[PDB]
Amino acid sequence: VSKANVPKIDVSPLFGDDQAAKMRVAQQIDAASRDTGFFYAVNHGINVQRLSQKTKEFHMSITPEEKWDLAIRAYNKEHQDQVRAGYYLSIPGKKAVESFCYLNPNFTPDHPRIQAKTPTHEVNVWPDETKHPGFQDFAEQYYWDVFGLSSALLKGYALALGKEENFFARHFKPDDTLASVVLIRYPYLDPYPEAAIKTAADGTKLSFEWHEDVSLITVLYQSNVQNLQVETAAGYQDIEADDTGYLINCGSYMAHLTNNYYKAPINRVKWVNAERQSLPFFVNLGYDSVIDPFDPREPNGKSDREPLSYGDYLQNGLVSLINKNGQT
Ligand SMILES: CC(C)[C@@H](NC(=O)[C@H](CS)NC(=O)CCC[C@H](N)C(=O)O)C(=O)O
Ligand SMILES: [Fe+3]
């Protein structure tokens, strides 16, 4: 098994006003997006030490009672509105992974999309404050911190594609974003449940099978345990861990709108028997966001692909991913 080329890109110029320096970051994003599809964003300004500490404190203290009370509909029939947000339970002996997903904190009962019952919009559920002091405040603050980094990254992707820097970010707004955070715990288990280990076609033991990401881009922090692989024509390559950087890649919405010029890399999660954290932020636009496709390979830039509404894309992508790779 070879190792993927995953460059470490200093993204700090994307927060500034040095336009030429931003173009030099964009060039690196372009190069990575045309190669394996992944890069590490470094010098990003997020305190990832506190992110990992606060996330660990939550995973390691929530009780079974609290998990039922927060559980998504797949684990608790009483919670028919929780298709996305809430707790995703492990199944001892069968399923090792567990996680907590939350959405835009601005999705309240006031919100027009909640009042209209538009799919993919939900009001977040939270544990008891006294049982988890500071957790909700940390998690909401983190949502906006990673939103800020993601907006910067989107300026880099726009410039990389020959567009003005707001081409993506203009659709990425705090009032309507469908972006999500998932706080995933992959546990150490001895013995490890065989049912929680899948065997790939190439014989590799996996915790999550091959897929393209359902996102515009994915902005991922993981603890320092190597696990991810990306598919190339020459086979799967290992993505090295870097618990100081954010692992970035394009999702299938980007592949659609660029006429596959920036592909959505196929990736999978190797089985590793080690306690670790996986904390993705899925950069999703608003429900009615439509980006007009283009083809950077063509002199005239024209694409014949249909503009896709982001909400319909997300609803179908999340359902399909559950159908293909299982309820997480
Ligand atoms: C590879 C990581 C991103 C992570 N995998 C994942 O998070 C996988 C593959 S991208 N993603 C999903 O299952 C989609 C979760 C969407 C979320 N419930 C929501 O409502 O928005 C892992 O560690 O398994
Ligand atoms: Fe993925």
From Swiss-Prot:
<keyword id="KW-0479">Metal-binding</keyword>
<comment type="function">
    <text>Isopenicillin N synthase; part of the gene cluster that mediates the biosynthesis of penicillin, the world's most important antibiotic. IpnA catalyzes the cyclization of the tripeptide N-[(5S)-5-amino-5-carboxypentanoyl]-L-cysteinyl-D-valine (LLD-ACV or ACV) to form isopenicillin N (IPN) that contains the beta-lactam nucleus. The penicillin biosynthesis occurs via 3 enzymatic steps, the first corresponding to the production of the tripeptide N-[(5S)-5-amino-5-carboxypentanoyl]-L-cysteinyl-D-valine (LLD-ACV or ACV) by the NRPS acvA.</text>
</comment>
<feature type="binding site">
    <location>
        <position position="211"/>
    </location>
    <ligand>
        <name>N-[(5S)-5-amino-5-carboxypentanoyl]-L-cysteinyl-D-valine</name>
    </ligand>
</feature>
<keyword id="KW-0560">Oxidoreductase</keyword>
<dbReference type="GO" id="GO:0042318">
    <property type="term" value="P:penicillin biosynthetic process"/>
</dbReference>
<comment type="pathway">
    <text>Antibiotic biosynthesis; penicillin G biosynthesis; penicillin G from L-alpha-aminoadipate and L-cysteine and L-valine: step 2/3.</text>
</comment>
<feature type="binding site">
    <location>
        <position position="180"/>
    </location>
    <ligand>
        <name>N-[(5S)-5-amino-5-carboxypentanoyl]-L-cysteinyl-D-valine</name>
    </ligand>
</feature>
<feature type="binding site">
    <location>
        <position position="211"/>
    </location>
    <ligand>
        <name>Fe(2+)</name>
    </ligand>
</feature>
<feature type="binding site">
    <location>
        <position position="278"/>
    </location>
    <ligand>
        <name>isopenicillin N</name>
    </ligand>
</feature>
<feature type="site" description="Transition state stabilizer">
    <location>
        <position position="208"/>
    </location>
</feature>
<feature type="binding site">
    <location>
        <position position="186"/>
    </location>
    <ligand>
        <name>isopenicillin N</name>
    </ligand>
</feature>
<feature type="binding site">
    <location>
        <position position="88"/>
    </location>
    <ligand>
        <name>N-[(5S)-5-amino-5-carboxypentanoyl]-L-cysteinyl-D-valine</name>
    </ligand>
</feature>
<keyword id="KW-0963">Cytoplasm</keyword>
<dbReference type="GO" id="GO:0016216">
    <property type="term" value="F:isopenicillin-N synthase activity"/>
</dbReference>
<comment type="similarity">
    <text>Belongs to the iron/ascorbate-dependent oxidoreductase family.</text>
</comment>
<dbReference type="Pfam" id="PF14226">
    <property type="entry name" value="DIOX_N"/>
</dbReference>
<feature type="binding site">
    <location>
        <position position="186"/>
    </location>
    <ligand>
        <name>N-[(5S)-5-amino-5-carboxypentanoyl]-L-cysteinyl-D-valine</name>
    </ligand>
</feature>
<feature type="binding site">
    <location>
        <position position="84"/>
    </location>
    <ligand>
        <name>isopenicillin N</name>
    </ligand>
</feature>
<comment type="subunit">
    <text>Monomer.</text>
</comment>
<dbReference type="InterPro" id="IPR044861">
    <property type="entry name" value="IPNS-like_FE2OG_OXY"/>
</dbReference>
<keyword id="KW-0408">Iron</keyword>
<dbReference type="InterPro" id="IPR002057">
    <property type="entry name" value="Isopenicillin-N_synth_CS"/>
</dbReference>
<feature type="binding site">
    <location>
        <position position="84"/>
    </location>
    <ligand>
        <name>N-[(5S)-5-amino-5-carboxypentanoyl]-L-cysteinyl-D-valine</name>
    </ligand>
</feature>
<dbReference type="InterPro" id="IPR026992">
    <property type="entry name" value="DIOX_N"/>
</dbReference>
<keyword id="KW-0847">Vitamin C</keyword>
<feature type="binding site">
    <location>
        <position position="213"/>
    </location>
    <ligand>
        <name>N-[(5S)-5-amino-5-carboxypentanoyl]-L-cysteinyl-D-valine</name>
    </ligand>
</feature>
<feature type="binding site">
    <location>
        <position position="213"/>
    </location>
    <ligand>
        <name>Fe(2+)</name>
    </ligand>
</feature>
<dbReference type="GO" id="GO:0031418">
    <property type="term" value="F:L-ascorbic acid binding"/>
</dbReference>
<dbReference type="InterPro" id="IPR027443">
    <property type="entry name" value="IPNS-like_sf"/>
</dbReference>
<feature type="binding site">
    <location>
        <position position="278"/>
    </location>
    <ligand>
        <name>N-[(5S)-5-amino-5-carboxypentanoyl]-L-cysteinyl-D-valine</name>
    </ligand>
</feature>
<feature type="binding site">
    <location>
        <position position="276"/>
    </location>
    <ligand>
        <name>2-oxoglutarate</name>
    </ligand>
</feature>
<feature type="binding site">
    <location>
        <position position="267"/>
    </location>
    <ligand>
        <name>Fe(2+)</name>
    </ligand>
</feature>
<keyword id="KW-0045">Antibiotic biosynthesis</keyword>
<feature type="domain" description="Fe2OG dioxygenase">
    <location>
        <begin position="173"/>
        <end position="285"/>
    </location>
</feature>
<protein>
    <recommendedName>
        <fullName>Isopenicillin N synthase</fullName>
        <ecNumber>1.21.3.1</ecNumber>
    </recommendedName>
</protein>
<dbReference type="InterPro" id="IPR005123">
    <property type="entry name" value="Oxoglu/Fe-dep_dioxygenase_dom"/>
</dbReference>
<dbReference type="Pfam" id="PF03171">
    <property type="entry name" value="2OG-FeII_Oxy"/>
</dbReference>
<dbReference type="GO" id="GO:0005506">
    <property type="term" value="F:iron ion binding"/>
</dbReference>
<feature type="binding site">
    <location>
        <position position="180"/>
    </location>
    <ligand>
        <name>isopenicillin N</name>
    </ligand>
</feature>
<feature type="binding site">
    <location>
        <position position="88"/>
    </location>
    <ligand>
        <name>isopenicillin N</name>
    </ligand>
</feature>
<dbReference type="GO" id="GO:0005829">
    <property type="term" value="C:cytosol"/>
</dbReference>
